[PDB]
Structure 1
Amino acid sequence: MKFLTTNFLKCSVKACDTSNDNFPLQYDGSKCQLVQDESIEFNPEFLLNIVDRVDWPAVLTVAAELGNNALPPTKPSFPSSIQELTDDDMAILNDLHTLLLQTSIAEGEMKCRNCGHIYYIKNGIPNLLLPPHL
């Protein structure tokens, strides 16, 4: 499961719908096994399209939980189009690509900060099935 996905995946239990703490989930840096995957080609257009939606505080939180505190405290900003990108912009987009698209959790677990429900990741795939009463 890609790091990017951690920036959008919330708790599945219905009761947690209106809770500030259904997102981000709380990733267990003890259990989570990371993989880096160069197969996904650098895609600056996608990054420009997703960056406004990205929740930077939740990026920092999950990164810290996963061992990485080397990130800037504020969300990178960019011009509105590919053709206005500078060499510096491009360097920063490359790092975002690596962080968000090329890094994934292969095995691990994460929990809802609000209800405590635990989810498991196996073979890069999160199990989001819930028991009937939730």
Structure 2
Amino acid sequence: MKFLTTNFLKCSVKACDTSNDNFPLQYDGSKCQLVQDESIEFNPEFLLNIVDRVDWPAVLTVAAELGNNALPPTKPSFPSSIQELTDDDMAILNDLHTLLLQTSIAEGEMKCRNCGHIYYIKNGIPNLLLPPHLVH
């Protein structure tokens, strides 16, 4: 499951819905095996839409769990059109593409910070229901 998905997965126990600790889940980085899918094509327009949607604090938390400590504490901001993007903006976009879309968890384990429920990812598939669309 793509790194991006960790930004939209909360504990499936209904009693946890009211907790501030139901999301994000706590990924066990000692157990999560990561794989790169480089066949996913870079699309800046699509990526800009994605970056706008993510909860940045949860990106930072999960990334650190999975061994990435090179992200800025504030979500990168970008101009309103592709034409206005700098080379530096594009380099950031490329890095975000690699992180959010090309990086997948093939196998792993993650838990609810509120209730301690342990979930699993097997052959890239979590045993918690995936949402049909990604929104906060």
* TM-score interval, smaller chain: over 0.9
Query: Equivalents in 1 of 2:57, 2:67: separation in Å?
Result: 15
Query: Equivalents in 2 of 1:96, 1:127: separation in Å?
Result: 26
RMSD, matched Cα: 4.0
| Alignment match, 1:80 | 80
Tell me which moved more, 94-103 or 67-76: 67-76
**Unaligned runs of at least 5 residues, structure 2:** none
Task: Give the C-alpha shift of residue 48 in structure 1.
Answer: 1.2
CA contact (8 A) 1:10 1:25 kept: yes
Tell me which moved more, 45-54 or 116-125: 45-54
Query: Equivalents in 2 of 1:132, 1:4: separation in Å?
Result: 14
Change in 2 beyond 3 A, CA 1:115/1:131: farther
Task: Give the C-alpha shift of residue 22 in structure 1.
Answer: 0.7
Please identify runs of 4+ aligned residues in structure 1 that moved more than 4 A. Answer: 129-134
1:64-94 alpha-carbon deviations (Å, 9 max, x no partner): 1111111112111111222221111111100
Change in 2 beyond 3 A, CA 1:81/1:30: same
Query: Equivalents in 2 of 1:107, 1:133: separation in Å?
Result: 23
Query: Equivalents in 2 of 1:119, 1:85: separation in Å?
Result: 40
Q: Give the SS at the match of 2:17.
A: helix
CA contact (8 A) 1:28 1:110 kept: yes
TM-score, with length taken from structure 2: 0.91
CA contact (8 A) 1:48 1:80 kept: no
Equivalent residues, number: 134
**Unaligned runs of at least 5 residues, structure 1:** none
Tell me which moved more, 117-126 or 83-92: 83-92
Task: Give the C-alpha shift of residue 130 in structure 1.
Answer: 13
Change in 2 beyond 3 A, CA 1:11/1:54: same
1:72-131 alpha-carbon deviations (Å, 9 max, x no partner): 121111112222211111111000000000001000000000111111000000012799
Task: Give the C-alpha shift of residue 12 in structure 1.
Answer: 0.8
Tell me which moved more, 97-106 or 77-86: 77-86
Query: Equivalents in 1 of 2:56, 2:82: separation in Å?
Result: 22
Change in 2 beyond 3 A, CA 1:46/1:133: closer
1:14-67 alpha-carbon deviations (Å, 9 max, x no partner): 001111111100000111000011010012111211222211111111011111
